[PDB]
C-alpha cells in the first residue's frame, strides 16, 4: 500500500501544571530528572502508549486499524495466529524456510496491526515471526529549565486490612511538579516505510493523536497537560536536502520582558522560528 | 639425557620393562669412543595413548631441512649416538609413556611423566597428591610442615625422583620443563605451596585440597580445558616444584577474567555463578605473599584497617541490600560496576551509595525493618576513611577482592 | 568519632549541614514515615543552590516546634548551624562527581558524631 | 578504474544524545568504556558495517557495487563462485598454497564488490580465494571527556510467553549517555590502491557516505547522532611529505571559557585548525 516519499522532521512542546508527568518506578514514584542538572525528563515509550490509546479510542476496531491488544495479552498467540492465518505451521524460535510465507508471517501483521505498522515489534520470541524496525523514531523529552519536584501528605478515614491497634488513621504521598515546559524531537524515514507500506492517510491519523493526545488523559495523579506547539519539516526528495541538527536549531525558546523569578504560565516564554534552506519546506500551523 | 639410559639399564635386568632388542665416533650419551653411530633413531608413539595431540610417529632429533645442518654434515650424524644407546633411550620412553602403568598424567598443553632414582613408594603418593581427585594425612602433614619420615619412616628422603614436561607441534616434540630434585626436598616446597593457598570454603562440596587442573581452567575464557595460555601452565608447574616466585603475567590475566565473567543463566545453575569463585581467591592470596610479601588472613579480619581492604568490604555490604530488596535479582551491580570501582574508586562510588538509599528506603517501608543492620555498618565502615582514592594499583586492585570474599562470606555465614 | 570539626572544604561542610538538619527533623516528629534523605538527597546532590533555602525553611519550624516544650536540647542544633554556615560564602550550582563523593563522607562523620551520647 | 595518485588522511567528529552508540556484549549492555579513565570507546567495525549500509542504500547493487560481508550470508559460496568464474574449481582446506588462478579469482572479487575493494578481506577459508589487504583504514574512537552512562528502568503490560506463573506488567531496562563528543582517524594509500583499482569516483562516494551516514540509522536505542567537522589532509605526491602525528596536531579542542558544569551541546566546545606544512594542504568538507 502507497508509501510516502518524502522525509520529515518535527518538533512538539507541552507543559504541565501541579502533576506528576511520567513516574520513576524505582525512585518511590517521583519525576524522572537529570542528575546532573535537574532537568526533568518523559520517556518515548510513554508517548507511544497514548498515541496508541487514541487510536484506539478513536477509531475502534476499524479495519487494518488493530492495535496489538496491547493490553495484558499474551504476545505468542499472535505470532502463531499469523502462521495459521497464513496457513503456515507455528515455529517458536524460527521463521518458517520459505521467504514469501516467512515475511507473509508478518506482512499479515502488518496489514491487521496500525502500531506493528508504524513503530514495528520484536518477533523473534517463543514463537518467531522475525523482526521489524519501524519508520517512526522519537527520543527523549527534555525541559527548557531545572525542575523541583515537591511531595505532600495525606489523611485516611479508615483502615484497609485488620489494624486492631485501633481520627486520622493513615499517611499517604503524592508528588508533583509546580510548572514545566518540555521539547521532543522525531523522524520520519521514507524506505523502511516502503517496506511496510506506511501511507499517508495513517500520518494525517498520526498528526491528528499529536493534536489531540492529552484531552482523553485525564487522571487523579495527572493534573493539567495539553501541547501548544507543532512544526513540520517536509524535504523534496526521498533523501533529505539538509542535516537534521540543522533545521531543529531554527527553533529557539526564551523568556518573555517580565521575567520575574520564577516560572508559572506558557505566557512567561517567547518561542520563534527562523527560514528554512530552499530544499525544505516549513509548516507550523499544524 | 642420562636418567633415561640409566632407567632403561637399572630394570632391563629384571623380567619386565625391558626387551634385548637393538662411520665410528664418541657417543655422547656414555662418552665411549669408536661406537657405531646411527644413522636415525626409532620413532615415538603418538596419539592419545602416546603424546596427546602429536603426530602419529614422532621424534626428539630430527634434522630434516638444510636450514637445521651444521658444518657440512647431514641427518642425525648432527649429533652421534651408538645404536644400542639410541634403541634404549627411546624404549624405556615408549615403556613410560604406557597408561598401563600409574606413571603418566595431563595438564593443559602437555603430558608429564615421572620415576625414581630407586623403586620407592614415592612414586606412588605423587600421581595423586600434586592433584587430588593416608588419603590425605601426609598432606596435612606438609602443610602444617612436619617432615615426611613421621608419617612413614620408610621413606628413604634420599632417594632421587625425575620430572619431564614434553609438548608437541606437527611431527616434531620439544620440551618445557624438567627436574631432578630429592624426594626430601621435593615435598617440602609441596608443602609450602599448601599453606598459601589456603582460604575458607565457600560451600562445603568444594575442594579443600585443590587441583592443579581445576586450578588453571579457571583463567580460561569459558571454562574450555583448551583456551588455556601454554605460557602460565609451564610457568605455575615450574614455580610449584622449584619454590621460586610466580610469574609476573599472573595476576593481570586473573584480573581479566573478573572484568569479562557476566553471569550464565543459559548454563542453568540454581544460584547465579559468582564472579569472585573460591578458586580465583585463592590465586590471588598466594601471589601476594611470595611476590609482595604482604600479611593477608585466612579470614575477615575486622581490625584490619586498609583503604583497598576496606573499600572491599565496603562493596560487599552494600551490594546485600540490593539482594534483599529484590529477590531473583536480573543484573547486580557486581555484572558490571565492579572492574571500575576497583580500579578508579572516586568515579563511582558516590552514585552507588546514593541508590543504596533507595533500597535501604525500601527495606524499611515493609517489615523486617533489619535496613537498620545494614545501616550501622556502613558508617563504622566509613569513619575509618578520609577520602576516597582517584586511582589504584594492581598490586592495591587483589586486596579489594580479598576485602570482598571475607565480607560476603560473613554474611552468607548468617544465611 | 573521625569528624574533622576545623576541615572547612565546602561540600564536607555542606554534608555535615545536612545531616544536623536530618537529626533535628528526626527529633521534631516522632514516628515519621522516612527520612529527609529518603526525600531529598538525590537532588540536593544535583543541584545545592536551588534546595538548601527550601530546607531551611522547614528547619526553623521544627526548631519552633521543640523549643517550647522543656526538651530545650534545640537550642544547641541551631548553635551548630551558626557556625557550619558561617564558613561558607556561597552555595553551589553544580558539584563534580569526584566532589559528591566528598559530600558524602561529611555527612556520615557528622551522622556518627551527633548519636555519640 | 585508476588508482588514486596521492596519500590522503582525516579527522572526524560526531555526537550523541540520550543514546548507546554502541553496545558491550560482556558488560550486560553498558557502553564501552576504558575502565581505568572512564572516557568511552567506540569501535571501528561499527563504522565499517554504516559505510556498508550506506553504500548498500544509495547504490542499490548496481554492477560493481555489490557488498560481500552481507546479512546471514555463507562466505565460502562466493569463494566458489569466483572460482567458478575462472573457469576453475579448489583445492582442500588445507590450502597452504595460492588458488589455481589467484589472479584472476582475486581480480573477479575486486571488480565485483566495493568493501572488498575498500577493506580487504580473510579469505584463506576452506573454499580458498586468497587473500587482501585494503588500502583505507581506520582506528577507534575515544570521547574528549569522561562520561557517566547511567540506567533507566521500565514497564511492559503485557507478557510474551504463556507461562504467566500467576495476567502482569513486566520489567525491563535501558542504558544511555546524556552527551558526549568522538574524534576518530583514518588513512589512505596510493600503493596499496594501485593492487586493487581504488578509484577516485569511490573516494568521492566514501566522502559523501561520511557526511550522512548517520541520517539513515535512527532507531529506539540510538537517540541522535550527527557528524559536525571533517578535515582532509592531501599530499602532494605518491608518498607523504611529513608524518601522520604531526598533522593530527594541527586540530585542537577546548571547551569554551564561558561554560561551565557538564556540557550539553556542540557549543560548549571550540575547535581550531592550524597551518600545515608547504607539503600538505587542507581543505574541511563540513
Same mark, same amino acid.
Given at each position: 500500500?502507497?508509501?510516502?516519499?518524502?522525509?520529515?522532521?518535527?518538533?512538539?512542546?507541552?507543559?504541565?501544571?501541579?502533576?506528576?508527568?511520567?513516574?520513576?518506578?524505582?525512585?518511590?514514584?517521583?519525576?524522572?530528572?537529570?542528575?546532573?542538572?535537574?532537568?526533568?525528563?518523559?520517556?518515548?515509550?510513554?508517548?507511544?502508549?497514548?498515541?496508541?490509546?487514541?487510536?484506539?479510542?478513536?477509531?475502534?476496531?476499524?479495519?487494518?486499524?488493530?492495535?496489538?491488544?496491547?493490553?495484558?495479552?499474551?504476545?505468542?498467540?499472535?505470532?502463531?495466529?499469523?502462521?495459521?492465518?497464513?496457513?503456515?505451521?507455528?515455529?517458536?524460535?524460527?521463521?518458517?524456510?520459505?521467504?514469501?510465507?516467512?515475511?507473509?508471517?508478518?506482512?499479515?501483521?502488518?496489514?491487521?496491526?496500525?502500531?506493528?505498522?508504524?513503530?514495528?515489534?520484536?518477533?523473534?520470541?517463543?514463537?518467531?515471526?522475525?523482526?521489524?524496525?519501524?519508520?517512526?523514531?522519537?527520543?527523549?523529552?527534555?525541559?527548557?529549565?531545572?525542575?523541583?519536584?515537591?511531595?505532600?501528605?495525606?489523611?485516611?478515614?479508615?483502615?484497609?486490612?485488620?489494624?486492631?491497634?485501633?481520627?486520622?488513621?493513615?499517611?499517604?504521598?503524592?508528588?508533583?511538579?509546580?510548572?514545566?515546559?518540555?521539547?521532543?524531537?522525531?523522524?520520519?524515514?521514507?524506505?523502511?516505510?516502503?517496506?511496510?507500506?506506511?501511507?499517508?492517510?495513517?500520518?494525517?491519523?498520526?498528526?491528528?493523536?499529536?493534536?489531540?493526545?492529552?484531552?482523553?488523559?485525564?487522571?487523579?495523579?495527572?493534573?493539567?497537560?495539553?501541547?501548544?506547539?507543532?512544526?513540520?519539516?517536509?524535504?523534496?526528495?526521498?533523501?533529505?536536502?539538509?542535516?537534521?541538527?540543522?533545521?531543529?536549531?531554527?527553533?529557539?525558546?526564551?523568556?518573555?520582558?517580565?521575567?520575574?523569578?520564577?516560572?508559572?504560565?506558557?505566557?512567561?516564554?517567547?518561542?520563534?522560528?527562523?527560514?528554512?534552506?530552499?530544499?525544505?519546506?516549513?509548516?507550523?500551523?499544524? | 639425557?642420562?636418567?633415561?639410559?640409566?632407567?632403561?639399564?637399572?630394570?632391563?635386568?629384571?623380567?619386565?620393562?625391558?626387551?634385548?632388542?637393538?662411520?665410528?665416533?664418541?657417543?655422547?650419551?656414555?662418552?665411549?669412543?669408536?661406537?657405531?653411530?646411527?644413522?636415525?633413531?626409532?620413532?615415538?608413539?603418538?596419539?592419545?595413548?602416546?603424546?596427546?595431540?602429536?603426530?602419529?610417529?614422532?621424534?626428539?632429533?630430527?634434522?630434516?631441512?638444510?636450514?637445521?645442518?651444521?658444518?657440512?654434515?647431514?641427518?642425525?650424524?648432527?649429533?652421534?649416538?651408538?645404536?644400542?644407546?639410541?634403541?634404549?633411550?627411546?624404549?624405556?620412553?615408549?615403556?613410560?609413556?604406557?597408561?598401563?602403568?600409574?606413571?603418566?598424567?595431563?595438564?593443559?598443553?602437555?603430558?608429564?611423566?615421572?620415576?625414581?632414582?630407586?623403586?620407592?613408594?614415592?612414586?606412588?603418593?605423587?600421581?595423586?597428591?600434586?592433584?587430588?581427585?593416608?588419603?590425605?594425612?601426609?598432606?596435612?602433614? #606438609? @602443610?602444617?610442615? !612436619?617432615?615426611?619420615?613421621?608419617?612413614?619412616? *620408610?621413606?628413604?628422603?634420599?632417594? %632421587?625422583?625425575?620430572? &619431564? $614436561?614434553?609438548?608437541?607441534?606437527?611431527?616434531?616434540?620439544?620440551?618445557?620443563?624438567?627436574?631432578?630434585?630429592?624426594?626430601?626436598?621435593?615435598?617440602?616446597?609441596?608443602?609450602?605451596?599448601?599453606?598459601?593457598?589456603?582460604?575458607?570454603?565457600?560451600?562445603?562440596?568444594?575442594?579443600?585440597?585443590?587441583?592443579?587442573?581445576?586450578?588453571?581452567?579457571?583463567?580460561?575464557?569459558?571454562?574450555?580445558?583448551?583456551?588455556?595460555?601454554?605460557?602460565?601452565?609451564?610457568?605455575?608447574?615450574?614455580?610449584?616444584?622449584?619454590?621460586?616466585?610466580?610469574?609476573?603475567?599472573?595476576?593481570?590475566?586473573?584480573?581479566?577474567?573478573?572484568?569479562?565473567?557476566?553471569?550464565?543463566?543459559?548454563?542453568?545453575?540454581?544460584?547465579?555463578?559468582?564472579?569472585?569463585?573460591?578458586?580465583?581467591?585463592?590465586?590471588?592470596?598466594?601471589?601476594? #605473599? @611470595?611476590?609482595? !610479601?604482604?600479611?593477608?588472613?585466612?579470614?575477615? *579480619?575486622?581490625?584490619?584497617?586498609? %583503604?583497598?581492604?576496606? &573499600? $572491599?568490604?565496603?562493596?560487599?555490604?552494600?551490594?546485600?541490600?540490593?539482594?534483599?530488596?529484590?529477590?531473583?535479582?536480573?543484573?547486580?551491580?557486581?555484572?558490571?560496576?565492579?572492574?571500575?570501582?576497583?580500579?578508579?574508586?572516586?568515579?563511582?562510588?558516590?552514585?552507588?551509595?546514593?541508590?543504596?538509599?533507595?533500597?535501604?528506603?525500601?527495606?524499611?517501608?515493609?517489615?523486617?525493618?533489619?535496613?537498620?543492620?545494614?545501616?550501622?555498618?556502613?558508617?563504622?565502615?566509613?569513619?575509618?576513611?578520609?577520602?576516597?582514592?582517584?586511582?589504584?594499583?594492581?598490586?592495591?586492585?587483589?586486596?579489594?577482592?580479598?576485602?570482598?570474599?571475607?565480607?560476603?562470606?560473613?554474611?552468607?555465614?548468617?544465611? | 568519632?573521625?569528624?574533622?570539626?576545623?576541615?572547612?572544604?565546602?561540600?564536607?561542610?555542606?554534608?555535615?549541614?545536612?545531616?544536623?538538619?536530618?537529626?533535628?527533623?528526626?527529633?521534631?516528629?516522632?514516628?515519621?514515615?522516612?527520612?529527609?534523605?529518603?526525600?531529598?538527597?538525590?537532588?540536593?546532590?544535583?543541584?545545592?543552590?536551588?534546595?538548601?533555602?527550601?530546607?531551611?525553611?522547614?528547619?526553623?519550624?521544627?526548631?519552633?516546634?521543640?523549643?517550647?516544650?522543656?526538651?530545650?536540647?534545640?537550642?544547641?542544633?541551631?548553635?551548630?548551624?551558626?557556625?557550619?554556615?558561617?564558613?561558607?560564602?556561597?552555595?553551589?550550582?553544580?558539584?563534580?562527581?569526584?566532589?559528591?563523593?566528598?559530600?558524602?563522607?561529611?555527612?556520615?562523620?557528622?551522622?556518627?558524631?551527633?548519636?555519640?551520647?
Amino acid at each position: 500500500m502507497t508509501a510516502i516519499a518524502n522525509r520529515y522532521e518535527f518538533v512538539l512542546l507541552f507543559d504541565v501544571e501541579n502533576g506528576n508527568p511520567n513516574g520513576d518506578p524505582d525512585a518511590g514514584n517521583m519525576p524522572r530528572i537529570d542528575p546532573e542538572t535537574g532537568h526533568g525528563l518523559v520517556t518515548d515509550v510513554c508517548l507511544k502508549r497514548k498515541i496508541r490509546n487514541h487510536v484506539a479510542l478513536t477509531k475502534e476496531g476499524a479495519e487494518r486499524f488493530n492495535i496489538y491488544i496491547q493490553e495484558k495479552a499474551i504476545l505468542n498467540e499472535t505470532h502463531e495466529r499469523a502462521y495459521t492465518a497464513c496457513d503456515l505451521k507455528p515455529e517458536p524460535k524460527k521463521l518458517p524456510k520459505k521467504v514469501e510465507d516467512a515475511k507473509r508471517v508478518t506482512d499479515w501483521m502488518c496489514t491487521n496491526f496500525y502500531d506493528i505498522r508504524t513503530f514495528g515489534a520484536v518477533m523473534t520470541t517463543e514463537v518467531n515471526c522475525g523482526q521489524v524496525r519501524g519508520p517512526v523514531q522519537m527520543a527523549f523529552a527534555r525541559s527548557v529549565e531545572p525542575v523541583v519536584p515537591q511531595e505532600v501528605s495525606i489523611t485516611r478515614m479508615a483502615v484497609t486490612t485488620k489494624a486492631e491497634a485501633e481520627d486520622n488513621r493513615t499517611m499517604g504521598r503524592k508528588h508533583i511538579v509546580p510548572y514545566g515546559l518540555y521539547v521532543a524531537h522525531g523522524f520520519i524515514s521514507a524506505p523502511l516505510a516502503e517496506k511496510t507500506g506506511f501511507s499517508d492517510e495513517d500520518l494525517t491519523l498520526f498528526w491528528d493523536a499529536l493534536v489531540n493526545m492529552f484531552e482523553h488523559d485525564r487522571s487523579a495523579a495527572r493534573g493539567l497537560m495539553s501541547s501548544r506547539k507543532l512544526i513540520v519539516f517536509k524535504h523534496q526528495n526521498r533523501l533529505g536536502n539538509a542535516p537534521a541538527h540543522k533545521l531543529f536549531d531554527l527553533v529557539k525558546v526564551s523568556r518573555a520582558e517580565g521575567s520575574s523569578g520564577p516560572a508559572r504560565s506558557f505566557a512567561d516564554y517567547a518561542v520563534t522560528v527562523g527560514q528554512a534552506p530552499e530544499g525544505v519546506e516549513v509548516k507550523e500551523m499544524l | 639425557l642420562q636418567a633415561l639410559h640409566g632407567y632403561y639399564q637399572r630394570m632391563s635386568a629384571d623380567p619386565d620393562a625391558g626387551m634385548p632388542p637393538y662411520l665410528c665416533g664418541q657417543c655422547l650419551i656414555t662418552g665411549e669412543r669408536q661406537k657405531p653411530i646411527a644413522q636415525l633413531h626409532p620413532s615415538i608413539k603418538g596419539g592419545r595413548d602416546g603424546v596427546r595431540g602429536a603426530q602419529a610417529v614422532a621424534s626428539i632429533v630430527s634434522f630434516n631441512n638444510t636450514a637445521f645442518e651444521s658444518y657440512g654434515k647431514e641427518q642425525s650424524i648432527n649429533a652421534p649416538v651408538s645404536q644400542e644407546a639410541a634403541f634404549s633411550y627411546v624404549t624405556a620412553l615408549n615403556y613410560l609413556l604406557n597408561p598401563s602403568n600409574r606413571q603418566k598424567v595431563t595438564i593443559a598443553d602437555a603430558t608429564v611423566v615421572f620415576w625414581a632414582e630407586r623403586s620407592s613408594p614415592a612414586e606412588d603418593i605423587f600421581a595423586g597428591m600434586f592433584d587430588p581427585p593416608r588419603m590425605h594425612d601426609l598432606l596435612v602433614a #606438609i @602443610r602444617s610442615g !612436619k617432615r615426611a619420615t613421621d608419617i612413614m619412616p *620408610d621413606m628413604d628422603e634420599s632417594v %632421587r625422583f625425575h620430572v &619431564l $614436561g614434553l609438548s608437541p607441534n606437527a611431527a616434531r616434540l620439544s620440551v618445557r620443563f624438567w627436574e631432578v630434585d630429592t624426594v626430601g626436598h621435593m615435598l617440602d616446597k609441596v608443602g609450602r605451596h599448601y599453606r598459601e593457598l589456603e582460604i575458607i570454603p565457600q560451600f562445603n562440596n568444594e575442594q579443600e585440597f585443590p587441583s592443579l587442573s581445576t586450578l588453571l581452567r579457571q583463567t580460561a575464557v569459558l571454562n574450555k580445558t583448551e583456551n588455556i595460555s601454554p605460557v602460565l601452565a609451564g610457568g605455575l608447574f615450574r614455580a610449584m616444584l622449584t619454590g621460586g616466585p610466580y610469574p609476573q603475567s599472573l595476576l593481570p590475566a586473573v584480573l581479566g577474567r573478573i572484568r569479562a565473567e557476566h553471569a550464565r543463566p543459559e548454563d542453568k545453575s540454581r544460584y547465579r555463578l559468582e564472579v569472585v569463585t573460591y578458586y580465583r581467591a585463592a590465586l590471588i592470596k598466594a601471589y601476594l #605473599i @611470595r611476590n609482595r !610479601k604482604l600479611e593477608v588472613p585466612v579470614s575477615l *579480619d575486622p581490625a584490619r584497617t586498609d %583503604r583497598p581492604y576496606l &573499600l $572491599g568490604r565496603l562493596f560487599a555490604v552494600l551490594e546485600k541490600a540490593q539482594e534483599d530488596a529484590v529477590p531473583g535479582a536480573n543484573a547486580t551491580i557486581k555484572d558490571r560496576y565492579l572492574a571500575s570501582a576497583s580500579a578508579n574508586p572516586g568515579q563511582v562510588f558516590h552514585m552507588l551509595l546514593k541508590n543504596a538509599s533507595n533500597h535501604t528506603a525500601k527495606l524499611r517501608k515493609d517489615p523486617e525493618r533489619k535496613a537498620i543492620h545494614y545501616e550501622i555498618m556502613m558508617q563504622e565502615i566509613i569513619d575509618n576513611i578520609s577520602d576516597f582514592p582517584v586511582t589504584m594499583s594492581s598490586d592495591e586492585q587483589g586486596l579489594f577482592m580479598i576485602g570482598y570474599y571475607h565480607q560476603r562470606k560473613a554474611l552468607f555465614t548468617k544465611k | 568519632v573521625s569528624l574533622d570539626p576545623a576541615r572547612t572544604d565546602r561540600p564536607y561542610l555542606l554534608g555535615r549541614l545536612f545531616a544536623v538538619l536530618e537529626k533535628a527533623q528526626e527529633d521534631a516528629v516522632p514516628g515519621a514515615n522516612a527520612t529527609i534523605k529518603d526525600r531529598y538527597l538525590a537532588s540536593a546532590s544535583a543541584n545545592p543552590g536551588q534546595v538548601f533555602h527550601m530546607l531551611l525553611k522547614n528547619a526553623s519550624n521544627h526548631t519552633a516546634k521543640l523549643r517550647k516544650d522543656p526538651e530545650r536540647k534545640a537550642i544547641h542544633y541551631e548553635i551548630m548551624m551558626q557556625e557550619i554556615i558561617d564558613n561558607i560564602s556561597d552555595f553551589p550550582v553544580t558539584m563534580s562527581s569526584d566532589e559528591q563523593g566528598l559530600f558524602m563522607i561529611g555527612y556520615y562523620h557528622q551522622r556518627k558524631a551527633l548519636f555519640t551520647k
